Amino acid sequence: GSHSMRYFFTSVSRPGRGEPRFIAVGYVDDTQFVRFDSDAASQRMEPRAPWIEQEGPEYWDGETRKVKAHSQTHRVDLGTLRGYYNQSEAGSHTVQRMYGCDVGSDWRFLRGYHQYAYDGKDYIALKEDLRSWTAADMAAQTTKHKWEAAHVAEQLRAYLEGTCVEWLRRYLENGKETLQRTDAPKTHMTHHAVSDHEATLRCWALSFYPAEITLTWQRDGEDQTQDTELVETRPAGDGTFQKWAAVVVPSGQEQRYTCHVQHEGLPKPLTLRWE
Amino acid sequence: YLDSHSGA
Amino acid sequence: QRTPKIQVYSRHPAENGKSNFLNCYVSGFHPSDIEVDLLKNGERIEKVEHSDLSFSKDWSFYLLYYTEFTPTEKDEYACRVNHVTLSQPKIVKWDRDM
Ligand SMILES: [Mg+2]
Ligand SMILES: [Mg+2]
């Protein structure tokens, strides 16, 4: 189906001593493929997926140079933003940035994004037109005028629509054995009595990829949300994801209840009933 | 492949 | 200003006596500084690793902490989390059914 490349950057100031903690991660779809951590020893961009390891020295040198540049820009911004908000030098603050591009099934550019936050709140973001800026407050408005004057959106648009998608396509090809493979959820139902006349049915979806999934309960063929619990989709730790949905039912009435599973790796949705 | 800056 | 959500779980369906991976997934929190320990019978497990810090669209952070472990009938596992938003450490016990 469709695909994305995304990078995430976090800088956290350290008022007591030294420079901010800086962590950057890159993803293709739901697969992390690179990382940089200012606390780590290498001080280089590092691979985190097999299909990126084939990239040569020129690649790693450039990604390292670029990611360090991001870190220094963030470091300066922490100082600037402290000033904009008239904040003390005593507190720790955070800058977050994320950017990426999406492509469709034909691998053609679909959309781009580039957004920036201070202390966990929207600060400034590129609009979907890749031309305009959303500034959340008057400090961000100051930044917006600066970025207009510096032709920032133009450069970002060029990257997002061109370079970003070109390299995404490259990665999709090189890592095709996993990146272009869907892993359908392995599903089963468990049963846990909660009294001598009621029980929890838990519908499990395991080892799936990508993370996107829908789990729903029906009772007698109609959606049921009352007396249900749905946990947030969670990483298994091996590149796949997990989720479950549960419903409390009167014991003996389990057969009324069906769990429905929708996932990209399933040609048709699955239906489960307590066995 | 990272983007190749303007400060806040 | 935003408190961590916590799920503690195994990578694979648990079978007593069979090696597995114990996960503690913390999400929805801000700021990013956080203390996460995995516990075996109340004691800190030493060899614990975690994923590289990332975040969701609402800017809240998430991390996966993990270590190898072997479920048994007698051993109790848990995740212990402290964060600026918490007045005291929050302990969530591992339940193999969740
Ligand atoms: Mg420096
Ligand atoms: Mg412009």
Q: What is the CATH number of the domain that holds A168?
A: 3.30.500.10
**A46 & A165 share domain:** yes
Let me know: does C89 contact C28? Beta carbons within 8 Å: no
Range of the domain at A2: 1-181
Closest Cα to residue A241, out of A272, A262, A265, A210? A210
Are A176 and A190 contained in the same domain?
A: no
* CB within 8 Å: A163 and B3: yes
* Shared-domain flag, residues A35 and A158: yes
SS (H, E, C) chain C: CECCEEEEEECCCCCCCCCEEEEEEEEEEECCCCEEEEEECCEECCCCEECCCEECCCCCEEEEEEEEECCCCCCCEEEEEECCCCCCCEEEECCCCC
Of the candidates C4, C8, C6, C53, the one whose C-alpha atom is nearest the C-alpha of residue C28 is: C4
Same domain, A169 and A221: no
Q: Name A251's Cβ contacts closer than 8 Å, sequence gap at least 6.
A: A193, A195, A196, A197, A198, A199
Contacts of A46 (CB under 8 A, 6+ apart): A34, A35, A36, A40
Torsion of CA C43, C81, A37, A124, to 10 degrees: 180
Nearest to C78 by CA among C27, C36, C20, C35: C36
Place of tokens 């140079």: A65
Name the residue among A111, A114, A117 with its Cα closest to residue C2.
A117
Residue type, A55: E
Task: Test B7 with A26 for CB contact under 8 angstroms.
Answer: no
* Cα A155 to averaged position of ligand 2 atoms, centre (Å): 7
Query: Does A275 fall in a domain?
Result: no
User: Could you tell me if A159 and A54 lie in one domain?
Assistant: yes
Using N-to-C axis directions, what is the helix angle for A138-149 and A57-84, rounded to 10°? 130
C-alpha A187/C-alpha A171 separation (Å) is 30
DSSP, res A52: G
CA A239 – CA A208 distance, rounded (Å): 9
Q: Report phi then psi at A274, rounded to 5.
A: -60, 125
A29 plus A131 within the same structural domain: yes
Could you say which architecture CATH assigns to the domain C1-98?
Answer: Sandwich (2.60)
Q: Write down how long chain A is.
A: 275
Which helix (H) or strand (E) segment holds residue A81: the answer is helix A57-84
* Residues A95, A159: Cα–Cα separation, whole Å: 22
- Residue A65: partners with Cβ closer than 8 Å, 6 or more residues away: none
Q: In terms of residues, how long is chain C?
A: 98
Element (H, E) at A199: strand A198-208
Give the Å distance between the CA of A252 and the centre of ligand 2.
65
Residue A58: in which H helix or E strand, if any? Answer: helix A57-84
Which residue out of C22, C23, C53, C56 would a mutagenesis test of the A interface target, given it has the greatest number of A Cβ atoms within 10 Å?
Answer: C53
What's A265's domain CATH number?
Answer: 2.60.40.10
On whether both A186 and A175 belong to a single domain, the answer is no
Cβ-contact C55, A8 below 8 angstroms? yes
Task: Check B2 against A80: CB less than 8 A apart.
Answer: no
Amino acid in position C10: S
In a domain, A101, yes or no: yes
Structure tokens given for A219: 């009772």
Technique used: X-ray
Which domain-ending residue is among A160, A181, A202? A181
Provide the residue count of chain B. Answer: 8
Phi then psi for residue C46, to 5 deg, are -75, -50
* Angstroms from C48 CA to nearest CA on chain A: 13
Please tell me whether residues A177 and A196 are part of one structural domain: no
What is the count of structural domains for chain A? 2
Contact present, A188 and A271 (Cβ < 8 Å):
no
N-terminal to C-terminal alpha carbon distance within chain A: 34
Query: Can you name the residues that pair with A258 across neighbouring β-strands?
Result: A218, A273
- Give every CB contact of residue A137 below 8 A, 6+ residues apart in sequence: A123
